Symmetry: C3
Subunit: 130 residues, 3 copies
């Protein structure tokens, strides 16, 4: 009755292949699936920093589909396959995207697997119901 | 003033043993504790695919206690102790439960421990306040 | 338009150093960044049980900044670097803080990294908009 799926514009088949929605808009909240730096075919961008950038691009595209932007993000959780050797690269990209306060909150955790990817960002955004 | 606990019908003592609620209903949202394929005594179902199925059964039972069903799930996060050798089994079960779109969103992550279990699913569901 | 950051009273520079907010108040919900047992300089409390206690103290301080307390927590997720040898210590502290029902829900997961810490707690609290 409210379960409305949101998908990035264009063609991205991982959502079709694995059968899950890119995001779910429910009332005044948008719950986004973890985003990864994947190409149109579902494979990861080889270079790490590039994968992180692409992940953010895919995130933005998914947010756009709901009329959202990074400014509407109210909760952030990131997963890392090897956070130790990846944080400098991640911060470079994060400080480029989140340039000025109020900064988003954040929970970064080290995981053992991300379906072939090395970075993933799970986000929740507010969607005012007007 | 709003912190109302929700428990699956019947007797399941892991919540009593570890002292935590199966789910929390707050306003128009239901935050469910991660569900696992555990028997009444708190031990895991030995066979993997069976554990995943039981986990979903336990999830459904917890949702039912709040008047919810899988259709009310607005966010899904799953943890895996060895995602590589478990995804085919997991998809078999997921495609049986989530048979048709709109599919739920999803974030699957590889973890190192799940208190003896090999699969866990953390969910958030919408509970319209009428 | 709603993205309002919340910070624990006093001086804690990890939020400044890593550029992220301690919590985000959005409508009737407060999304708190994972809390860890860190000193004012950002380093962890050496003793485990002490780190867990400090983590809870830092959590309470962040909640206070929004006018919240542990009673307003509606969702709990904890990460552990070595859950096997840490659960007895964690429960000692949890049973001291969450002494009586309704207990909070809970999702505990084993992770590989937490930026030098061994325990982290990500929480969501309800903030009635009156
Ligand atoms: Hg929005
Ligand atoms: Hg419901
Ligand atoms: Hg509050």
């Amino acid at each position: 009755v409210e379960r409305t799926a949101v998908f990035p514009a264009g063609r991205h088949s991982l959502y079709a292949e694995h059968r899950y929605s890119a995001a779910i808009r429910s009332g005044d909240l948008l719950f986004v699936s973890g985003q990864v730096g994947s190409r149109e075919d579902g494979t990861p961008e080889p270079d790490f920093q590039q994968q992180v950038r692409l992940a953010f691009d895919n995130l933005h595209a998914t947010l756009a589909a709901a009329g959202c932007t990074f400014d509407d993000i109210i909760d952030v959780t990131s997963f890392h396959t090897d956070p130790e050797n990846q944080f400098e690269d991640i911060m470079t990209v994060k400080n480029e995207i989140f340039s000025a306060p109020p900064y988003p909150n954040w929970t970064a955790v080290g995981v053992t697997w991300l379906a072939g990817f090395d970075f993933e960002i799970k986000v929740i955004a507010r969607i005012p119901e007007q």
